[PDB]
Amino acid sequence: GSSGSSGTYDEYENDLGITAVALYDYQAAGDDEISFDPDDIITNIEMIDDGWWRGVCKGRYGLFPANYVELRQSGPSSG
């Protein structure tokens, strides 16, 4: 049993998809690429290139190296 500040209704729509956390500060070489700070949170992460991805950060969707970021993941009791 759990609860919190649900609200007046629980019929919302949140499609964030995949998320990741930056490891180091990056500077999008150009417009195509996006610039995000280290230890930041990114949503709508689309897996395109094993080395580069595309997600919506601080209101910006562009190409970015998956090396300067880590795929969010937790390890609970029952893996």
Range of the domain at 59: 1-79
Say how far apart CA 67 and CA 42 lie, in whole Å.
Answer: 14
Say how far apart CA 55 and CA 67 lie, in whole Å.
Answer: 14
CA count, 13 A, side-chain hemisphere, 54:
8
**Tokens 């629980």 identify what position?**
10
CB atoms within 10 A of CB 71: 12
Expt. technique: NMR
**Tokens 């601080």 identify what position?**
58
Number of domain units in the chain: 1
SS (H, E, C) 4-22: CCCCCCCCCCCCCCCCEEE
CB atoms within 10 A of CB 58: 11
H or E stretch covering 57: strand 52-57
CATH number assigned to the domain comprising residue 30: 2.30.30.40
Length of the chain: 79
Per-position b or e across 19-43, b if 16+ CB within 10 A of its CB: ebebeeebeeeeeebbebeeeeebe
Contact 66, 54 (CB under 8 A): no
Q: In Å, what is the CA distance from 57 to each residue of 8, 46, 69?
A: 29, 12, 12
